[PDB]
Amino acid sequence: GSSGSSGEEFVAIADYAATDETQLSFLRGEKILILRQTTADWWWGERAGCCGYIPANHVGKHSGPSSG
Numbered sequence: 001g002s003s004g005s006s007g008e009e010f011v012a013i014a015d016y017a018a019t020d021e022t023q024l025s026f027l028r029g030e031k032i033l034i035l036r037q038t039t040a041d042w043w044w045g046e047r048a049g050c051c052g053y054i055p056a057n058h059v060g061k062h063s064g065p066s067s068g
Contacts (some may be wrong), residue, residue, distance in 0.1 A: 010032045033046045
């Protein structure tokens with residue numbers, strides 16, 4: 001199947017739309033995988049069978065109790 005190998009699960013604080021063909025587009029809440037950070041501004045995420053870069057602001061927060 002498709003198993004993850006070390007990653008950071010995050011949630012989009014707001015729906016975003018990749019402006020380039022090197023960005024990932026998700027919807028607020030979407031579980032974004034922060035493969036690598038690299039920069040404190042640009043993060044390296046990974047979509048479904050996709051691999052692109054993601055910004056550092058649209059994603060944040062953490063998972064736990066009371067998620068809605």
